[PDB]
Write a protein that binds this ligand. Structure first.
Ligand SMILES: [Mg+2]
Ligand SMILES: [Mg+2]
Ligand SMILES: [Mg+2]
Ligand SMILES: [Mg+2]
Ligand SMILES: [Mg+2]
Lengths: 282, 268
């Protein structure tokens, strides 16, 4: 059973969330199986950012066992800004573990190198998720985002426990049950860093949401990149911490790395600066 | 100085917020002057509902000193549902005190405050009026004043309704949409606007505000089941300073959980 171990107060520099199995930390990047049910293409999603929140919480590639920590921009806590008509992130946002957008090769669909992170996941179900949650999802489709010119695919997915899950099997079903969501998703990922002073992003395929079959193919590619990475065989692993506690055939296997993690020290959420309330009209 | 006194846990039937002046409860309907600066048309707004929340909190006309409580229907706490692409209420939402739509919807006139900062329930902030829309909900006229906190960084650039279009492009469209559809998930019909949903200008809004203030002047001087107790207007029949002292002390209870169903995004 997966649980979380929180260090510190949310919305601070000291905040960390480790994922635990049997009450002991494992790598959120490496040790959670991509597949909950391989035969039925049910995936484990690691949730990073709940819907309608701002704090840019992410799996930290360079820290041992890859806890979720808030990103910083020049030393300051990063919060994604509200871009009208949206409030923070408009999906439960996270990643598939055991995947990598390989930065060392140009990807043919986008003609761009990978962004060096796990493939990311937009989970569209009704219940708001929590940071460090491992939930089980079905893939519905995928969008080819170029995030500051880097390949940054976004998988469209739904929690298998969602009341609608049985009715959502491919990307066209998203438009049927969530009309406007995919178009809003396109806008969101285009504009969300404009308030940070960054350019608009762009999508390949004029932002088309490719179907499930397409999505599975790309998820496979990223899993395969990760398999090379974790084996120590990437041409450049970018100083990623490859320490893991469940993959005995890898050079960086270490069951003991788990014991070295501090105990939970959960504190109440710290206040967020009122600037983060601001609604930007772009 | 205005503060708040909270009784109970948020998101419960027991929750009440009173406004305090220098530590003493006063009526949120009657004791807060409509005008912070009459000469320059600066109004006091009583905030009921923060932007991006769901709990339908309102000044209750029928309880002494008119605390803000959660609305209910047949015993059940009311939460406005999330209507895509909106998250809860899209404005800081509240009322002008010392106003009354004499039936006409029987309530103070409501205020959509459009500034950047999210407000708090029971906050008395100072705003300038920019415009007004006339919502029709169940045969009742339901005026909504568009306003901005005078402390907002943009307040000096916003003086009339056309400035909302320039600095907040799409907000007026979203407002029209929101108030049309927000009760469809509850099983209620779509609402409609007068004037084909046009936001009338500041002048038109000031005329409505003054009118509803004149009505309330009649009300408080002595009424469909409204408690008129006040603690700051000594020559009113219902003046009673002891009312302030009869209010329980603050509870410091943490917010109660809200049922997960309220998370749901409706596509309507
Ligand atoms: Mg980044
Ligand atoms: Mg990046
Ligand atoms: Mg990415
Ligand atoms: Mg009502
Ligand atoms: Mg009304």
């Amino acid at each position: 059973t997966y649980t979380t171990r929180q260090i510190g107060a949310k919305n601070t520099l000291e905040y960390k969330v480790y994922i635990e199995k049997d009450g002991k930390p494992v790598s959120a990047f490496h040790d959670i199986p991509l597949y909950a049910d391989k035969e039925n293409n049910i995936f484990n999603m690691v949730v990073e950012i709940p819907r309608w929140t701002n704090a840019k919480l992410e799996i930290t590639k360079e820290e041992t066992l890859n806890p979720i920590i808030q990103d910083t921009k020049k030393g300051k806590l990063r919060f994604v800004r509200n871009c009208f008509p949206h409030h923070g992130y408009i999906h439960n946002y996270g990643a598939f573990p055991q995947t990598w957008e390989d930065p060392n090769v140009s990807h043919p669909e986008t003609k761009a190198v990978g962004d060096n992170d796990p493939i990311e996941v937009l989970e569209i179900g009704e219940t708001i998720a929590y940071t460090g949650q491992v939930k089980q999802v079905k893939a519905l489709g995928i969008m080819a985002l170029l995030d500051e010119g880097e390949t940054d695919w976004k998988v469209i997915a739904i929690d298998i426990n969602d009341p609608l899950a049985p009715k959502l099997n491919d990307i066209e079903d998203v438009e049927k049950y969530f009309p406007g969501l995919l178009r809003a998703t396109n806008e969101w990922f285009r504009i969300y860093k404009i308030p940070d002073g960054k350019p608009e992003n762009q999508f390949a395929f004029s932002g088309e949401a490719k179907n499930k079959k397409y999505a599975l193919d790309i998820i496979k590619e990223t899993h395969d990149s990760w398999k090379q990475l974790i084996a120590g065989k990437s041409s450049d692993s970018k100083g990623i911490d490859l320490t893991n506690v469940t993959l005995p055939d890898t050079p960086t296997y270490s069951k003991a790395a788990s014991d070295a993690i501090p105990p939970a020290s959960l504190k109440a959420d710290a206040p967020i600066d009122k600037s983060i309330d601001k609604w930007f009209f772009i």
